[PDB]
């Protein structure tokens, strides 16, 4: 845990259906996201932080948590976005004589920042007299080992914890889920999903001179105005499909029951007598 391993996942597609559908995970909590929706999203990158703790410490692995693990071994940001999956590994990480291979930090001058790893093995001074690399009075080794033997309670048994943190940046998405990509449709209202970025609009050919490193553009509203088709490197402008207030021009009900309908600000094609006014 103090030396929690980190892996990077990028430029690939992952089927999370098998992930949250597995019953082998004791704890499965997603913050900022749901297990099901992963297959319908794309992310620039993912970081998998893998480590081992005891059952009681499982709760500590969560945003807004405090404790030895959270403070000294692994801290999550308050705005963390991702999923934590913890499963018992008693059959894998427990030795009959004692599995001392798993360690955790017990002392530190200050709590860890989010996604900060500290692997230093310098003696922790807890007393007036400083420690010149030698233990003794108020001079302790910063790391301690788990027992991890099969005869423990569930709270003390080993659990393998993996945190998948998905980076949702403006850089191009590189991690997507399953789901095939349908053919491109233009000049029609459609629910588009470009690289996990979803929306609704009308897609048209664009003359904008996108730079090679530029995938999509945003307007003053920071809203997706143009995109680059991930399959075909072409620029497509997205425009709002069609919306407008429906009002009713009606003479007094006492007079007549026939009325006309006014669709404000819509062409007379997206909808007897039809009259196109400004």
């Amino acid at each position: 845990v103090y030396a929690w391993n980190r892996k990077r996942i990028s430029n690939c597609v992952a089927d999370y259906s098998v992930l949250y559908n597995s019953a082998s995970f004791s704890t499965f909590k997603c913050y900022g996201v749901s297990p099901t929706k992963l297959n319908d999203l794309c992310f620039t990158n993912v970081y998998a932080d893998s480590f081992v703790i005891r059952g009681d410490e499982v709760r500590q692995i969560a945003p807004g948590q405090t404790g030895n693990i959270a403070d000294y071994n692994y801290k999550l940001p308050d705005d963390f976005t991702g999923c934590v999956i913890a499963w018992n590994s008693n059959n894998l990480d427990s030795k009959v004589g004692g599995n001392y291979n798993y360690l955790y930090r017990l002392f530190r001058k200050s709590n860890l920042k989010p996604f900060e790893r500290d692997i230093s093995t310098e003696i922790y001074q807890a007393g007036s007299t400083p420690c010149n690399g030698v233990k003794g009075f108020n001079c302790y080794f910063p790391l301690q080992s788990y027992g991890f033997q099969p005869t423990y309670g569930v709270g003390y048994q080993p659990y393998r914890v993996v945190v998948l943190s998905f980076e949702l940046l403006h850089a191009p998405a590189t991690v997507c889920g399953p789901k095939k990509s349908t053919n491109l449709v233009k000049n029609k209202c459609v629910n588009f999903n470009f690289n996990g970025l979803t929306g609704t609009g009308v897609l048209t050919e664009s003359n904008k001179k996108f730079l090679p490193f530029q995938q999509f553009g945003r307007d003053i509203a920071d809203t997706t105005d143009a995109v680059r088709d991930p399959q075909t490197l072409e620029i497509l402008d997205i425009t709002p499909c069609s919306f407008g207030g429906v009002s009713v021009i009606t003479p007094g009900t006492n007079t007549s029951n026939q009325v006309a309908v006014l669709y404000q600000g819509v062409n007379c094609t997206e909808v007897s007598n039809v009259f196109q006014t400004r």
Partner: antibody, heavy 122, light 108 residues
């Protein structure tokens, strides 16, 4: 619970000393307890030899590990000890005890057996 | 190595007094300790675990000062049948399960 020791009370030097502890107050297949052996020579202190878990594995003393082995039998609900190349310093009373190791360093022998005296001489 | 040292080798007290046995570990780690009682011809009996927890059936007069490096077993009111040999036992990384040299408690 109770533990009862069994085995020859005499072992010639440079020969294997075999002992078998049979429990009857519980179950050895329980996943909460170890089963250990502790010996003491006459008029001397206690010496933990080795502790065995139900599955197969065990851990022994860092001095007698070369010439010591432990075995278990859930069917007969009993665990045995072999001490190879027994010298004259193994003349002692051997107890078999029940061990509970809950956290890390908490390792206490809950209930002891009466123990059997094995004197090794020629 | 984590070496165990009990004190004193022999303790001379009479019934009604209180006894204080010391079990100090080497200048090393600190955690739990077990105290056991052994009378002549009997297997050692568990008195205290986790550095102060009376075993099942231990009178209230037994107690443990579970503190750092050094530990202490205290017997409030010495009864006639409370004079025996007392062993303290640790479980370190290496060697595992170390036993104390034992303290002989006799009637002065």
């Amino acid at each position: 619970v109770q533990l009862v020791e069994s085995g020859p009370g005499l072992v010639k030097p440079s020969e294997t000393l075999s002992l078998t502890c049979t429990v009857s107050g519980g179950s050895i297949s329980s996943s909460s307890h170890y089963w250990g052996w502790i010996r003491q020579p006459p008029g001397k202190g206690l010496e933990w030899i080795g502790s065995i878990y139900y599955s197969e594995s065990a851990y022994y003393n860092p001095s007698l590990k070369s010439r010591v082995t432990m075995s278990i039998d859930t069917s007969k609900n009993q665990f045995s000890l072999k001490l190879n190349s027994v010298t004259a310093a193994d003349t002692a009373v051997y107890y078999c005890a029940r061990v509970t190791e809950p956290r890390w360093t908490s390792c206490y022998f809950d209930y002891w057996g009466q123990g059997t005296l094995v004197t090794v001489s020629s | 190595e984590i070496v165990m040292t009990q004190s004193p080798a022999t303790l001379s007290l009479s019934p009604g007094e209180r006894a204080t046995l010391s079990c100090r570990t080497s200048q090393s780690v600190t955690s739990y300790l077990a105290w056991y009682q052994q009378r002549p011809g009997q297997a050692p009996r568990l008195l205290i675990y986790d550095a102060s927890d009376r075993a099942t059936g231990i009178p209230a007069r037994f107690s443990g000062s579970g503190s750092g490096t050094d530990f202490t077993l205290t017997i409030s009111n010495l009864e006639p049948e409370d004079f025996a040999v007392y062993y303290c036992q640790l479980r370190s990384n290496w060697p595992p399960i170390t036993f104390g040299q034992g303290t002989r408690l006799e009637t002065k």
